[PDB]
């Protein structure tokens with residue numbers, strides 16, 4: 001799955017996820033969001049299960065982007081959790097949590113939840 | 124917040140999160156879970172907003188653990204998303220997503236959601 | 247949106263959601279899941295915003311199914327939260343939480359998160 | 370658990386949840402939020418597993434509030450999913466999803482996730 005994962009992925013919004021999978025389980029790369037308070041590339045880091053159960057079973061993985069680079073600071077961070085499924089139409093199906101840096105007035109409302117599907121071809 | 128974050132944290136279950144915050148926004152360290160299919164330490168990586176809005180506002184951050192080390196492979200990965208709040212009782216308040224590597228029979232049921240609060244003193 | 251909502255909806259898994267929207271904001275109906283520990287129809291109840299902001303804006307809503315009927319007891323319950331969007335291809339886009347009745351050994355792992363999209367035509 | 374559930378509950382924010390559990394699995398009542406865009410009581414409806422596995426196991430349940438009453442319309446709705454645990458310190462431990470009625474500019478950001486713990490005594 002190392003070879004499967006490494007590369008460029010696109011989600012349903014047009015965002016671009018460029019990642020390298022390490023042999024040890026590391027994930028490193030850059031993320032560019034087509035939406036929100038974001039411009040250009042942001043660093044990402046994460047992990048994956050580098051010894052999946054190959055018996056028709058996806059590979060677990062996750063990663064994080066803090067939404068600060070040289071251009072913008074959106075005072076927020078997103079984590080995606082999901083699985084890589086290989087094959088002719090390879091996908092990474094994820095859910096995500098986006099937490100914003102705020103005061104303790106709306107701290108109850110600090111996190112969005114959503115989902116992203118990544119494919120090797122761009123919509 | 125770099126100095127604030129770096130160190131050892133404990134959640135309400137007794138798990139131990141040892142992290143170093145980089146000046147650039149990197150998070151690196153190890154995680155030991157007191158529960159689930161887990162034993163000893165696991166690598167973690169993540170990111171944080173290294174230029175918060177200091178106006179009473181938390182620092183956004185997240186990180187990932189893939190639940191494979193030399194002892195066990197739980198074919199899963201967890202991402203935590205939340206915020207660091209500094210001060211006399213410093214906390215990292217998070218929500219988390221745990222995705223399991225499974226077939227496409229229960230792929231609809233691939234992810235748990237939960238929440239963890241981390242403190243500098245252990246319960 | 248009352249007229250919009252009331253009716254039969256289908257999700258991407260083949261499940262069937264039959265609902266009536268009340269003028270007061272009530273939602274009542276039955277749910278049949280194509281997957282999981284489920285057979286035949288289950289009662290549902292929920293609510294919707296019966297005075298949306300009609301300025302291109304979806305209508306907020308949610309509902310609950312407890313997964314017990316005359317045939318099966320799956321000791322669980324699911325809530326869906328999302329929005330109705332009207333028009334030629336009307337949709338209800340939701341996220342959901344499914345909580346299982348368990349002991350306090352895996353209570354940290356009590357809830358799944360997922361997402362469903364409902365359409366008026368069945369896949 | 371019918372007798373257990375029916376009554377007045379308080380969460381960690383000071384909100385008040387007044388509910389009646391039906392013998393058939395119905396939940397009906399009113400919710401008053403101490404926070405957000407909310408004033409006075411709002412109708413709620415939901416369901417619970419009215420034949421739990423009494424072997425130390427919680428009772429699954431959920432419910433919905435649409436945040437419109439005679440005073441305010443917050444164009445949103447919240448669903449809570451969780452479990453009732455009985456005894457000397459009875460609790461309802463939940464996670465929740467709050468979806469807002471918005472356009473398809475930030476539809477990716479339509480839902481918050483959080484968690485509430487309800488007790489029979491108010492903080």
Ligand SMILES: NCCNS(=O)(=O)c1ccc(NC(=O)CCCC[C@@H]2SC[C@@H]3NC(=O)N[C@@H]32)cc1
Nearest residue numbers: 015033035036037038067074076078096100116
């Ligand atoms: N009131 C002030 C602003 N309003 S606010 O609500 O407080 C708020 C604050 C910060 C954000 N932060 C971002 O906008 C960064 C990019 C997020 C891209 C997501 S990351 C998940 C999803 N997938 C993707 O490829 N792009 C999207 C979002 C909303």
Ligand SMILES: NCCNS(=O)(=O)c1ccc(NC(=O)CCCC[C@@H]2SC[C@@H]3NC(=O)N[C@@H]32)cc1
Nearest residue numbers: 138156158159160161190197199201219223239
């Ligand atoms: N049917 C086979 C097993 N059953 S299964 O359901 O498929 C399943 C599969 C894998 C897992 N994976 C783990 O158990 C690793 C540690 C998780 C620790 C969490 S991580 C969030 C929480 N916080 C913490 O400090 N510890 C806990 C959990 C459940």
Ligand SMILES: NCCNS(=O)(=O)c1ccc(NC(=O)CCCC[C@@H]2SC[C@@H]3NC(=O)N[C@@H]32)cc1
Nearest residue numbers: 261279281282283284313320322324342346362
């Ligand atoms: N170890 C014992 C069983 N394993 S367990 O993990 O503890 C567990 C326990 C109970 C359930 N409960 C159901 O299976 C009922 C139907 C759920 C349908 C969902 S509801 C959201 C989604 N949308 C839909 O239309 N169908 C699906 C699921 C998993």
Ligand SMILES: NCCNS(=O)(=O)c1ccc(NC(=O)CCCC[C@@H]2SC[C@@H]3NC(=O)N[C@@H]32)cc1
Nearest residue numbers: 384402404405406407436443445447465469485
């Ligand atoms: N930009 C315009 C407003 N900003 S917005 O972000 O779009 C937005 C829109 C609507 C809401 N809707 C409410 O505020 C109603 C009460 C929610 C109470 C929760 S319900 C879960 C939690 N538990 C509880 O007892 N009270 C709290 C929240 C945020």
Ligand SMILES: [Ir+4]
Nearest residue numbers: 052053054198
């Ligand atoms: Ir395996």
Ligand SMILES: [Ir+4]
Nearest residue numbers: 107108110216
């Ligand atoms: Ir918070």
Ligand SMILES: [Ir+4]
Nearest residue numbers: 108216238484
């Ligand atoms: Ir919280």
Ligand SMILES: [Ir+4]
Nearest residue numbers: 115361362363
């Ligand atoms: Ir979707």
Ligand SMILES: [Ir+4]
Nearest residue numbers: 075175176177
């Ligand atoms: Ir700032």
Ligand SMILES: [Ir+4]
Nearest residue numbers: 093230231233
């Ligand atoms: Ir899946």
Ligand SMILES: [Ir+4]
Nearest residue numbers: 093115231361
């Ligand atoms: Ir999905």
Ligand SMILES: [Ir+4]
Nearest residue numbers: 238484485486
């Ligand atoms: Ir809690």
Ligand SMILES: [Ir+4]
Nearest residue numbers: 298299300444
């Ligand atoms: Ir309006």
Ligand SMILES: [Ir+4]
Nearest residue numbers: 353354356462
């Ligand atoms: Ir629990």
Ligand SMILES: [Ir+4]
Nearest residue numbers: 238354462484
């Ligand atoms: Ir909890």
Ligand SMILES: [Ir+4]
Nearest residue numbers: 115116117361
């Ligand atoms: Ir999807």
